[PDB]
Structure formats: structure tokens, C-alpha cells
Design a protein around this ligand. Structure first.
Ligand SMILES: Nc1ncnc2c1ncn2[C@@H]1O[C@H](COP(=O)(O)CP(=O)(O)OP(=O)(O)O)[C@@H](O)[C@H]1O
Ligand SMILES: Nc1ncnc2c1ncn2[C@@H]1O[C@H](COP(=O)(O)CP(=O)(O)OP(=O)(O)O)[C@@H](O)[C@H]1O
Ligand SMILES: Nc1ncnc2c1ncn2[C@@H]1O[C@H](COP(=O)(O)CP(=O)(O)OP(=O)(O)O)[C@@H](O)[C@H]1O
Ligand SMILES: Nc1ncnc2c1ncn2[C@@H]1O[C@H](COP(=O)(O)CP(=O)(O)OP(=O)(O)O)[C@@H](O)[C@H]1O
Ligand SMILES: Nc1ncnc2c1ncn2[C@@H]1O[C@H](COP(=O)(O)CP(=O)(O)OP(=O)(O)O)[C@@H](O)[C@H]1O
Ligand SMILES: O=P(O)(O)OC[C@H]1O[C@H](O)[C@H](O)[C@@H]1O
Ligand SMILES: O=P(O)(O)OC[C@H]1O[C@H](O)[C@H](O)[C@@H]1O
Ligand SMILES: O=P(O)(O)OC[C@H]1O[C@H](O)[C@H](O)[C@@H]1O
Ligand SMILES: O=P(O)(O)OC[C@H]1O[C@H](O)[C@H](O)[C@@H]1O
Ligand SMILES: O=P(O)(O)OC[C@H]1O[C@H](O)[C@H](O)[C@@H]1O
Ligand SMILES: O=P(O)(O)OC[C@H]1O[C@H](O)[C@H](O)[C@@H]1O
Lengths: 294, 296, 309, 308, 299, 298
């Protein structure tokens, strides 16, 4: 008797209708405006009572507005007596830490967002490649942390002639688990960069990290990879935020291409950068939603 | 040995300092900045262990930015082992809101829960749009009133106050407007939009529209025009929270007001630059007393 | 396939059956009783497993006995593994507050919020109610609360029972009832008026001021409830001395406690009309002015709606 | 540091001021009435901010008005920013259960647990009560619960008031109070016995069984409370037909509902002794057999102990 | 439409399968082990989405590993989006309190309620258990708790195995099993007696078969001395019937040397290895009771 | 003013009294035993009312028992009306995982979050722990959690114990300790390399190699790692860990491994294992915990 109701806010209209087309359904009717004083207004237009409802919004643009907007729609479908409300958040906001010498720091912002999603009334969360997977434990809720790697792997094979050889390098220490894993799915060798010194060593170098925001490191990392004798250097990321200086710096850096997936709207930045190519994840999320709905 | 601690956000720094002056202390060092990707950042610069923390943040300007900042700073003081954390919210956001049934305040309630989930232990605000918002929490809430200062201003700035009339621009501020009447021994009038109709007698008397907030300001401008059509000598507009967004200031500039009075729960210095008819009432003392009281 | 079970408390049985009659079902077997030491006893007599339970009980009578009786059968249907328990509370208890000037600030609504938390902790999953004293009480919960209006019923009673309703005036007994009266006024496309008692001071006389004109019109005072009924009786007196042909009083909740019935028998009203969120039969037997408006359609349709669309 | 402000609800004012007298304090300014429509009103008259509040209300009279009155007063002192609120409930309401059989399972204590959850949600932080019908009720909370015993005062009354207490017999009126009597028995260095009324079957006659010997001995039945009192009256008669010189009854909680007074006026008790967890003043004016033990010192010290 | 899913833990494989058999099912695939560093590991082998899962685990053997295993498995099926997770706990752990009793008040059951809160936070939605040491433990949760009785099967065992049963006497080993003894006694229309500790006796056993009844039997001292006293009071025979037979250290050695006719327990706790050294122990099977309870809550 | 009260369990008697000495006080009276049926028993011997109590129990030994007893101790303290209860857990149990290679998604920390929720419901108000396998476990609570580092004491142990440390090389088995090796390395302005299965990237030829990671259990990875590190030229190989677990066949392995010393901290009882393995050396962290306890007590 519950049928899937699919919503979307203001954050990523394109991805949302893409998964709608993968599921065979239309987006639900909802009007999100902002009042003159900047208070977010969300009014549902469809009946969602007794339905399994999925609200898709990524933490990308004006996030605080997108996040507040998301919470308002979650609380709105919960007060409306829906059987279930699922937050589909491709890019989870506040996942990073801006961090000591003697102890760590509770991730107060990431756990604060978990608590607000929980109190708003969420009953399921679907997200992709979190900055730290242990954020699933910031919740007493099921959290699907889907990996984009198959997407990354197939894209390489399919797109890069030289993949069979090549080398995967991480721009940082913390990503090493990430390169390693991707490397051995290709039965391939690895190297890593640390702020600049490089470890490991005429191959197609491909830097892999979870997200790319200001992009400074990965550009200086590319400059060192070509100084270490690399044929080409690629940059493949899950979340492409490209804030500030980023696109200008990608405009002054020598990438064959920089690949990301569409957890974040990029078209308007594609128009300013010929490098960027985007992988479609409509089916992973689409498929994950359908799985959750049985 | 808790000591009072005053932290200010990005919303209303002048007001924060102003109550700090009233309490005789310094403000707590905190740097609030947004990251390149516009995520809010907060880094407290002092120790708050065993302290009575007070963060002064009004619901104004960039609302979701300001509230999210407030929540991050509250959490940061609770994970830091504060004795208590009190959110001072001069103008509470989202306070505002079918045949056959009523809607639920679902945003106000949502912010209540987000402040509670962040770790707030006490709330100090002023003039809630509905006093029952105190019940959206399970923690003490000191919904303060600006009337004392409004009656004082009225007596001391309107010559003919003994023979004025307090008018409510709507059908919901009635108990707010009779309150004033009873305290000035003056009558009130009520306006309804049905073409606006007025109930009451205004001919040859000074009319004073009073409400809690003014945002787009259309109802009070049209209300002034009718009150003058009913023969009112002068029109005042007295508001606790002066949001003044949109086309409002243009409207009061074209409006037949003698003056419009608001409180400093929201920054108004910028708006008076563009509007000579606005005047503000300091409520830094009201919040100051509420803090002192709550601190014991 | 979750089914639907209607339970009645003690407070208003008649309305429970009327909602049963409108839903096409009969009432679920439950025995409610007072022990010798006046301890509430609730034994439900039919299976509620996997069922959609609705318990109908109004905040009237011995308020605390009915409220505890309601909480116990909620927690009894909740421990017995029902799929959902909806508390249908036609008149919500503790909705008003005994404040009075607390100047410089307001007082927290401690009783209404405490009853909200007790309904929540008892195990309620949904709330239905009719005309809350303040709609923001919906926000005192974390579960869906439906506050229905009786306005449609008041408007149809008014059109079918008051001869010159076209030229009436809708009056509020107080400030704070202005929105309600205006609403009703615009709906009948008639105008409104307001009455404000000034607070007596040391050496005055009590006075009510009327803002608005009622001369030569049928006056209709409407508020959310009537309990002690002094304000509306003096309101009828003042409306008639302002030149009103008649005075009615139409409330959604008719509490009638203390001297109310004695006061209406001696007041100047044409009628005092209320809804059946509270049993009124034994009151009309002592007061011929009370008339009743049935609202079992609204509660019945809200129940049917809350079950399967 | 917080002081102690102590408040009395309507139910047992006399005992609250006895506890006040024991603590060297006076009761706090509070007005508790009823509105016309029977809603409870609680308005605190003094400041409780940063103080240690203790509210004494017993489970008696009109119980749901008193329980409601207790909860409203707790959440009123909690929202007023009290340092800590403690509910002193000498006789805890809804403690017993009307199960009166389950054959392959037991029933849940729905009412006692629900009252535990309402005290918790209202804002209670500590509970102090006396002789719970089941000690396990302490586990119905996530806050401390002090379930104090009246046994010292009962032993004291027995020694100073039963002439032949040295060879007295402690009797339990039921199977469940056995552990109770045992306790008392070994403390007086005397023996016990049990009364058990069997299920009346159709066509059988009312049959009560006595286990133990009470011949030529003073019998004293002992149970956590007394409410309608039928089982203990018949227990008296059975004990006397079994050759007991005298029968006493000592209960911690004297409810005395319904027909009890009349029952006891026609019962062959020498004395029915209870504690003052419930007002008894007006009952002794209709029953000369009722005698009260004061338990002010136990609650008084439990409070002083909780405050430090 | 959710189907019944039954899982079994380390504690009682036999009885688990045994209820699986009375239900017409097989257990679900679960693998359990303990890592080299002694940490409990659970890996469910089936999908439990949308399922009505039942986990059977008794408070026996090594209890903290069994209980923890139980909590990971509940807080494993619950996160896997099961329709509902039910803990089937035949013998509830930590149900008793170390009765070191302060003279003027009582002690709260801190361990039983602690076990209650950990089962609740793990994600349990229902609990099925048998003869709790105190029934009010049902009140340690805000979720439905089924406290099933073995007394039907005990009464039937008694009538069908003790020849002289119409004139026996139900006895209790202390002052807390009195209600229980009373209960079966009236069901059998038979008088009763109780022992309180010098050990004394209240009641008459002369020339009767005496049967000790209580919920659990552990180090067994009380029931052995109770047997000795009952025979000293002129009893023909002494039996001991309980629900949960824990039989910890010195117990087996104690009853082997005790004047018991037989000692009866249920299979809420595994015994067979205890029957290997003890010929007086006999087991009453209660798989039906749990089966009935599972099926009824599942509807 | 609340005094500070200290309790210890069965897990680490040695450590607990050391922090007691550093704080200038003695340990609290508590008898912990296990009933005949294996039911942990706790009985507090001293009044904790209105006091600030700290209970130290490590996820060492037989963990389920010590953790269950820890919970009993914390809840014994909460209903005894203690001013506050803080769980001092030097080595957090169930911190680790076995999720691995689910293709396309992670497995949630079901176990560590479960221990968090169990510590929270038991009544804990603060946690003091050291070197969590993942710092994000701090976020598994809503209460302050101090995840202290042992890195100061390891840096000073080396700087005073390895002669060839100005030019050393710091390394681990699989990358995952990278959020780690870097940190130790740059605090000495030193290069580094990492091992991943078996290959190694970086070069340590003719230099002292130093494996560092969080906890050692089985130890296979680090022994094979030590051997390969020689296969590439290091002068000597050391192994520096914080928690010294050494379960299963670890000690036989290290006795057969070519370490010049394997160094751990005393978050876990070591003495029994030092009598069987001469390569073990212990760094004492009682001061760090002492500072954290003292600092939260104000
Ligand atoms: N919104 C934000 N939140 C936290 N840090 C931010 C931030 N925006 C920018 N930063 C900056 O970006 C830096 C990137 O830090 P990272 O090393 O990516 C976090 P990490 O979790 O340690 O990654 P790793 O785990 O992959 O090392 C932050 O440390 C800070 O310097
Ligand atoms: N940020 C905001 N939140 C809610 N309403 C807003 C809003 N910004 C603009 N509005 C507009 O202002 C209207 C609400 O004004 P009111 O109806 O006076 C609030 P209310 O709570 O209904 O007042 P009451 O106290 O009179 O009921 C909205 O319906 C919409 O027309
Ligand atoms: N049960 C009750 N609760 C509160 N006040 C009661 C009462 N019974 C009688 N009263 C008295 O009658 C008065 C009626 O007050 P209400 O009108 O119910 C207050 P309100 O909730 O602020 O709403 P309003 O502003 O719409 O009038 C109370 O203030 C008090 O004088
Ligand atoms: N695992 C265990 N847990 C708790 N107590 C245990 C125990 N093993 C042995 N004991 C002891 O067994 C006794 C408790 O048994 P019981 O008295 O039957 C529980 P009770 O609730 O006090 O019983 P009662 O109803 O018979 O009075 C105490 O001496 C206690 O310390
Ligand atoms: N007691 C234990 N608990 C959990 N896993 C254990 C374990 N003992 C051994 N293991 C094994 O050791 C493996 C640990 O691998 P790790 O590399 O630590 C995964 P991680 O938690 O992501 O840490 P990393 O960041 O070091 O990768 C476990 O996944 C399992 O293979
Ligand atoms: O380069 P900046 O932003 O100035 O400094 C930090 C850089 O390092 C981070 O990983 C991003 O790549 C940033 O670009
Ligand atoms: O005329 P509008 O701008 O629509 O409304 C004017 C004011 O009245 C409205 O309720 C808002 O409060 C505005 O501030
Ligand atoms: O009724 P009285 O107490 O005389 O007046 C108080 C009025 O105010 C409330 O609105 C009641 O309904 C009462 O009418
Ligand atoms: O009230 P009664 O008819 O006596 O019998 C019920 C008895 O059961 C209880 O023990 C009460 O005290 C009552 O006596
Ligand atoms: O075993 P003992 O030390 O003699 O006494 C303890 C009694 O209580 C326990 O449940 C035992 O099994 C005994 O019956
Ligand atoms: O081969 P095992 O030791 O049994 O298991 C894998 C090893 O590798 C891991 O990092 C641990 O060190 C283990 O010891």
C-alpha cells in the first residue's frame, strides 16, 4: 500500500529527476521559496500520508538553507503521517574537521547535523562516500553509505587506454586506504603524496581523494607528479565542490581531465572549465532507494 | 565557581556589547567564519569549563546561517564541559506561521528541538509571536516583554497620550493592544482586512498601531491610511521586532507616519540611515536583568 | 490488514457511539471502573493486536480521573502490541492558563505541556481534538495532532436557526477571541464587534467597553468555551443596552461549571448554543437555553481520514 | 549552595509539617486549589531557583487529583530552575495489581510503571517512599528511589505495646506477605505462621487455611497495607478459633476505604496499628481500634540524607 | 508480508532448534565467534529486511558473552531494517539481587534494570521469557514483555508422575516461593508448607510426599537441607521441581548426595551434560510455550 | 565541594593505582567478584554521594566481563547519587571492525556504537580514553569524550632511546595507520614509508625502520613487515604501538621475529607477557590520564 513518493528541494534538481527516471516516476510536488526575511518556506503539494517518502537534497549550494530546508520537509512529511521518511543526501555536509597535540576533537558539526536530521524525523539516510565512514555511527538510524568506486573503476577502464599500467596516488596521508583499495581492484601499484614530498614512483598518474573543494593541494600534487616523470596526471574525486579559487587553479593546472561524480551540480562550472567530466550515479542511488523500499 | 560568560554571534554585535556593558564584563572570544564552501565555522577562544555561558544571537539577517551558527556554538560549549549554556534569542526565528483545522507550528517547534538537541539548557527571548512557544521546549524559557519600555516611550514622547488610541493592525494583536490601553487609561481600535474596516472611534485622536513585528510593512501602511481617513491627527507604529525586509522601508518613506518605533532586538542602524522615521528602544537592560537573574 | 477499534472512556459515551455510528462500527469492549480507594481500573476486553485503536474521551467531568483513565488505556493498548493508538480528546484539558499580568514576561504553560508529555509517555501516536484554546498546543507534541474547527457547524446552525442572521453582528466576549469572531464574520459576510472589560481599579465601577456597532441587530457572541459564564452574561447585558434586538452565545466547548446554569437562567440571552464535545444533556434539563450542535461528523471523518485516507 | 525548601501538597499536611518540624524548617508558600471545572492549580509562592526542593504528597484521598497535583508541582519547580526536585511519596499510588490470574503468563504492572514514567517526565529527580508494595518498583525509574522500611517503628510499637510479645506469633494474611512476617519474626525472636484463603469453587464453602500454631499465643498479622480489610477480619476470626488469646493487626499503610471501618468495628481485633503515611485522624474518630505509628523521623532523615 | 525468522545464539542450540521444529522452520544462518582478543562477533548470513526476527538466547553458560552476543545480534538485525526484533530469553540473566539487605530500606535491582536498558538500546521491540524471578521485571521496559509460566507443564508432570500426588504437600524452600507453592497447591487442591531458616518448618508433612518448588536452582544448598529437614519431619519422599536449573559449582555434587527422589527442571537451560553426571535430573520441555508465544506475537 | 573518588576494576590493577599515586590519593573500596553462575558482582565499599567518581577499566583481558562490570559500577554510582561518573577506558573495546570489502558501501560501526550506547545508558557523563582506533567514536556519544594521544611519550621514548633517530624512518603494514605515521614522522622532520599487502613503497635502505600503529593483537602483519623491511635494508626494526593486546599466537611470533624491541604503553596489563617475551618494553601513561582526570575535575 505504501508507494514511493520522491521529493527534491532546491539543491540539485538535475540528479533528482534523473533518479526519478531510473525509478519510473515523477517528482512530487513541492514549492520551496524563501520569504523576504530569508526564512525558508516549504509547502508539500501532494499527499504523502501512508507513503514511503524520499527527499533528495545535497549539501552543496547555500547549504545552510538547503539543510534547513531539508529538515523542514522531513518534519513536514513526518507530521503528515508518512510511514517513512528517508533523507537521501549524496554529499553529507560538515563531514570534515578543520583540525591539538594530545587528544582529538569530537566532530561536533557532523554529529550536530546527525542529531538535527534525527530530531527532524528522519527514519533512513542514504549517502555517498562519506569523508569518514564512522559517521554512520553518529546515528541510531540506518545509514547507507554507498561507494562510488565501481563508478570510478569502470570509468577508468572505459576511458583511459593506459589504465592497465598506470599508478594511483593520494594527495594526502588519510586517503591512502582509499587509493590502495582502488588500486588493487585494478591489480595496480600505488604511491602517495604528503605536504612537498612524494613516496613511490613514465606512467599515467591518477590522484584519487573523496572530495575536491579549493583544489590547491591536488594542483601542486600534479605539478610534482609531472616533475617526477609522469606521462599524464588525472584527478578523480567523488564530491566536486570547486569553491573559490578552484576552477581558476584547475584552469592554470595541467590535467588531462579532472573527473567527478554528480553528487554536486557542476554544469555551470563545466561552462568555465573544459577539464571537468562527470560520472552519473542516478542508478546507484536509484537502486539503493528501490532496495530500501522492497 | 561559575562566572558569567558572554559570547556574541554574527547577528547583532552592537546589542551584545551593549548588554555586556550593563553587566560590567568583556565578551568571550570567539571567531565565527564561513569556509570557502560556505559552511559555518566556529572556534571558541577561551575555556568554558564550569562556566555559565550566554550566547546572544537574534533571528535576523541570514537566518539559517545565524541559527546554524548558534547551534554549532551551543554544541561547542556543551562538549567543552560548561556548567550551563543559555541561548539568548532576542527575536526568535520561525515564530510566524485551512477550513476545518489548524496548521502546526512546525518550524518553531523544529528550531526548539534543534536548540535542545544542540545542548541548550535555557532560553531568553523577547516578545515571542505566541507565548506558548515557551512550551515548545522542556527547558526554562524566559519570554520577556517590551511593554514597560513601550509605555515609557509613549508617555514621554507623545504629548497627547492621555487621549490617544491603540490600534491593532489585525485580529490577532487585540490582546496586545488592549494591554496598552489599560495601562494608559486609553481606548483602542481594531482593524480588519475584509478593503479594510475599522472598529472603534478615531476622529480627532492620535492613533498608535502596536504589534510585535514588522517585516514587509504593507498592513501598517494601509492601516495608517485608513486611520487618517477616519480622522486621526497622527499615526505612530510601535513594534518590538523590526525586521524591515523587502519593500518595507520604501513604504514607510512614502507612508503617512509621524514615526515608527522598534526595539534593538534586530540591528536597525543601517535602516535608519535610509529612514528618518524609525527610532529604537534599548532593551539591553531587559536582557541584562534576565541574565543576572538566571545566573543567580 | 490493520483494523480499527473505537474505545470509549467515561466522560462522553454518547458522542463515542455517535462516532461509531458514523463510522459503521460499534464500540470496543472495555471496562472502566474505580477501585474502592478511587484508583482507576482499565481492563480492555477485546484483542487490539495489530489494530488501529482510537480512544475517545473528553476533558470534562472529573478531569483527572478521565485523564488518568485515558492514559491507562493508551498504555494498555500500547503494551498489547496495537499498531497505533490515537487519543481522540474532543475537549483538550488544561488548555487555558491562570496567568494575569505577569508583566515583563509570560508564564510557561506548565499544565497543558505536562499533559502533552503524559499523553506522549503513555504511548499515544496521534492526537485528534476540536478547537484548542490555543492552536500552538499542537506543537507541544512530537506526534501528529489534529485540531478540528467547529466553525462550519456554527455557520450552518446560524444560517438555519437565526432569522435575521444576514444582519447580525459577531461579537467577541474579550480580546484574544478576535480572530475567531472575524473569521466567522467574513464567512457569513457580516460585520463584527468587540467587548473589553476594563480591570476594575481601586475606586471605580466595573466597565465593559464595546468597540463596534450593534444597534438594531442580532448580536452573536462566539468564543472557544464557556465555563463560569459571567463575562458573557454581562456581555449580553451590555449588548442589549447598546440597542441589540437579541443576543446569542455560541461556543464550541460548553463547560458550564459552578454558577453557570444559574447565571444563564437569569441572563438575557436568546440562546446559548454549544457543541457536544462535552455531554450537555443533564444541563438542558436545568437550562432551557442550551442547545446542542453535534460534531460527530467531524471526529468521525477525522478518524476515517487518519486510518486509510 | 542549595537550601531545602519543602512543600506540602493537599494530601497529608500534617505529616509534611511533622517532617518540617524534624528538619528545623517551615513549609514553603504554596497555594493548591481546584478550578471550577476541577482542574488543579498549583502556584508556588516562593523562589525555588538553585534550591533543593522536596514535595511530600501521599497516595490517598482523591488520588488522581493528588497525583496530578504532585506532577504539576514538580514540573513547576523544575521549570523554575530548581537545583533538584525530590518527590516524597510515602504511600506510592497504583503499586498493587488486579491480576487475579493469568494462567501461562503474568500481566504487566501498567499503572505503577506509568506513574513512574509520569513522575519522570514531570521532572522528578529522586523518589523517596515507604514500604513499596514491591521493591522492584525502584527499577521502574532511571533516577534514585529510596524505599524506606517501617519495620523499626513496628518492632518498637510491638515491644512497648504488646504485653506478651516475647511469645507472640507473627502471621501473614496472604502468601505474598510471608517474607515480611519472617523479617519481623526473627527480629523479635519469635515464630510465625501463614494464613491462606483457598479459591472458592462452586459448591465448596469459604475455607481459610492456617499454617503455624497460634494456640495460647498473641497473633499479630502483618502486611504492607490495609484497604478494605476483609481478609484480615476473617484472619482474626480464624486465628481466634485456632486458640489464640489475642489478635493484632499492624500495617504500614492504612487506606481504610469502603467498608473497612464498619468491618473493624465488628471484627475481633484488639488493635489495628498503621503508620501515618496516610491521614488517620478522622478514622480513629469512627474506629477506636485504630492506632497510628508516626514515621516522620524516617522520611525526615531520608530527606536530610539526600540533601547532605 | 513479513515471515517469521528465528535465530539462535550460543546459549541453547537444542531448544532453539526445538522451537524451530515446532514451528516448521529452520534456523536462520548466523555465525558466531569470538575473535582472538575475546571480543564477540556476529555475522548474519541472511537478509533480514522487512522480516520479523526472533533471537533465542538464554542467560546461561558464560553469561556476559552470551548477553553481549545477543545485544550485537539485535543491534545487527535492527540496523539491517528488520520489521521487528524480538529477544527470546528463556532464563533472564541478572534477575536476582544479592540480598545483602540494608536494615531500613531496599536495594534497587541495578543489574536487572541495567540488562533491561541495554536490551532496549540495542533495539529490541519485544521480549519473550519464562518465569522471571520477579514478575515486575516486566516493568523494567517500555516494550511488551511476555513472562511465560512453566506451571502448566509442572502440574501435568506432577499428576502424571507422582502416584500419591493427591495427597502431597507443596513446599517452598524459603519465604519468597510461598506464592508460587500456594498457586500450584490450589490448583492441585492440596495443602502446602514452607521452610524458613537452624532450619525450621511451618506446615505438616507427616507421611506425605513433599515437593520443593521454586523458580531456580543454583548451588542448591537450601533445597538439600530442605530435603533433609522434610525427611526429618516424617516425609515419605522428597522431590524438587523448579523451572530454571542453573546447577553451578557444588550443586551436582550436592544433590547426588542428597535425599531426592528426582529433581525436575525445564529445558530453558541446557542440562544434558548435567544429566550425564546426574541420574536424578529430569527435564520438562517448554519448547511449545515459546513456540506458541512466538506465533502469537507474530499473528 | 565534591572530592574526587577513584575506582578500579579487575582489568587493570596496576595502572589504576599508579594514576592514584599521581593524583596523591588511594583507590576506592570496591570488591568485585563473579558469582558461581558467572554473573559479575559489584559492591561499592565507600560513599560516593555528591562526589566526582572516576572508574578505570580497560578493554583488556576478558572484555565482556570487565565491560559488563564497568557498566554495573557506573550504574551503581548513578543511583548512589554521585555528583558525576566518568568512565576512564584506556583501551576502548570493540573500536575495531571487520567490515572490509563490502562492494559499494560501508558497514556501520555496529559494535562500537553499541558499547557507546551501553556506556551512555549505564549513566556515564564523561569518557577519558587513549588513541581510539577512530577518533569519530567520540561522536558516538553526546557526552564529553577525551581521546588522548600517547604520541608525546612515544616521541620522547624514542628520542632518548634510539641513537640513530635523527635519521630514522617511520612505517606501518597497511596504509590505514597513515593518519598516524605522518604525524609521528613530521614531529621529528623525518621521511617515511608505508607497507601494504606483500609490497612496500618508500625506501629505508641502510637505516633504522620504525613501524608504528595503534594496537597489536595477532602481530603477523608487523612481523612479516619487519622482515621485509630488512629485505630492503634497514639497520634495525622497531615496533611502536599504544595498546599492547598480544592475543592468540602473538608472543611466539615476536619471539621469532627480528625486532630489536617492540614498545607499547601500559593501557593494558603487560607484566605477564614480559615474562615470556624480552622484546617488550613499556611506556607509562599514568601521568597523561592523571592530567586529564585532574583537569576535568577542575
Ligand atoms: N567546512 C570545513 N570543515 C572542516 N574543515 C574545512 C572546511 N572547509 C575547509 N576546511 C579546511 O580543509 C582542510 C581539509 O582537511 P582534511 O585533511 O581533508 C580532513 P580529514 O578528515 O583529516 O581528511 P583525511 O581523513 O582524508 O585526512 C581542513 O582541515 C581545513 O583546513
Ligand atoms: N518567514 C515567515 N514565516 C511565516 N510567515 C511569513 C514569513 N515571511 C512572510 N510571511 C508572510 O506573513 C504571513 C504570516 O503572518 P501572520 O498570519 O500574522 C503570523 P500568525 O502566527 O498567523 O499570527 P497570529 O498570531 O495573528 O496568528 C505568512 O502567512 C506570509 O503571508
Ligand atoms: N481551568 C482553568 N485554567 C485557567 N484559568 C482558569 C481555569 N478555570 C478558571 N480560570 C480563570 O478564568 C480565566 C480564563 O482565562 P483564559 O481566557 O482561559 C486565558 P488564555 O489562555 O490566555 O487565553 P485568551 O487570551 O484567549 O483569553 C483564567 O485566567 C482564570 O482567571
Ligand atoms: N547471579 C546472582 N545474581 C544475584 N544474586 C545472586 C546470584 N547468585 C547468587 N545470588 C544470591 O542469591 C540471593 C538472591 O536470591 P532471591 O532472594 O531469591 C532474589 P530476591 O528477589 O531477593 O528473592 P525473594 O523473592 O525470595 O525474597 C542473594 O544472596 C544473592 O546475592
Ligand atoms: N578483535 C577484533 N575486532 C575487530 N576486528 C578484528 C579483531 N581482531 C582481528 N580483527 C581483524 O583485523 C582487521 C582490522 O583491519 P583494519 O585495517 O584495522 C580495518 P580499519 O578499522 O579500517 O582500520 P585501518 O584504518 O587500520 O584500516 C579486522 O577487520 C579483522 O580482519
Ligand atoms: O590551498 P589552500 O586552500 O590555501 O590551503 C589548503 C589546501 O589544501 C586543501 O586540501 C585544499 O586543497 C586547499 O586548497
Ligand atoms: O501587505 P503585506 O506586506 O503582505 O503584509 C504586510 C505585513 O503584514 C503581514 O502579515 C506581514 O506581517 C507584513 O509585515
Ligand atoms: O466567569 P467569571 O469568573 O465570573 O469570569 C471569568 C471569565 O473569564 C473566563 O473567560 C471564564 O469563562 C469566565 O467567564
Ligand atoms: O477487600 P476484601 O474483600 O477484603 O478482600 C480483598 C482483599 O484482598 C486484599 O488482601 C485486600 O486488603 C482485601 O481484603
Ligand atoms: O545455596 P546456599 O548457599 O545454601 O543458599 C543460597 C540459596 O539460595 C540460592 O538460590 C541457592 O541455590 C540456595 O537455595
Ligand atoms: O594472519 P593473522 O594474524 O591471523 O590475521 C591477519 C593478521 O594481519 C592483521 O593486520 C593482524 O595483524 C593479524 O594478525
Amino acid at each position: 500500500s505504501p508507494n514511493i513518493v520522491l521529493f527534491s528541494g532546491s539543491s540539485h534538481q538535475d540528479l533528482s529527476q534523473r533518479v526519478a527516471d531510473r525509478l519510473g516516476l515523477e517528482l512530487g510536488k513541492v514549492v520551496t521559496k524563501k520569504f523576504s526575511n530569508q526564512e525558508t518556506s516549504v509547502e508539500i503539494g501532494e499527499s504523502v500520508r501512508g507513503e514511503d517518502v524520499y527527499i533528495i537534497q545535497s549539501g552543496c549550494g547555500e547549504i545552510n538553507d538547503n539543510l534547513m530546508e531539508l529538515l523542514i520537509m522531513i518534519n513536514a512529511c513526518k507530521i503528515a503521517s508518512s510511514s517513512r521518511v528517508t533523507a537521501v543526501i549524496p554529499c553529507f555536509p560538515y563531514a570534515r574537521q578543520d583540525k591539538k597535540v594530545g587528544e582529538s576533537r569530537a566532530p561536533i558539526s557532523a554529529k550536530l547535523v546527525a542529531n538535527m536530521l534525527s530530531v527532524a524525523g528522519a527514519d533512513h539516510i542514504i549517502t555517498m562516500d562519506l569523508h569518514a565512514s564512522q559517521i554512520q555511527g553518529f546515528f541510531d538510524i540506518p545509514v547507507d553509505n554507498l561507494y562510488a568506486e565501481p563508478a570510478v573503476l569502470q570509468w577508468i577502464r572505459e576511458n583511459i587506454a593506459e589504465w592497465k599500467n598506470c599508478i594511483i596516488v593520494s594527495p594526502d596521508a588519510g586517503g591512502a586506504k582509499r587509493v590502495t583499495s582502488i588500486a588493487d581492484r585494478l591489480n595496480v601499484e600505488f604511491a602517495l603524496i604528503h605536504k612537498m614530498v612524494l613516496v613511490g614512483d613514465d606512467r599515467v598518474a591518477i590522484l584519487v581523494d573523496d572530495m575536491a573543494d579549493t583544489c590547491g593541494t591536488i594542483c601542486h600534487a600534479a605539478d610534482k607528479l609531472l616533475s617526477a616523470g609522469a606521462t599524464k596526471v588525472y584527478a578523480i574525486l567523488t564530491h566536486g565542490i570547486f569553491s573559490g579559487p578552484a576552477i581558476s587553479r584547475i584552469n592554470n593546472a595541467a590535467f588531462e581531465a579532472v573527473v567527478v561524480t554528480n553528487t554536486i551540480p557542476q554544469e555551470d562550472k563545466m561552462k568555465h572549465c573544459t577539464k571537468i567530466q562527470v560520472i552519473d550515479i542516478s542508478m546507484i542511488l536509484a537502486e539503493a532507494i528501490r532496495r530500501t523500499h522492497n
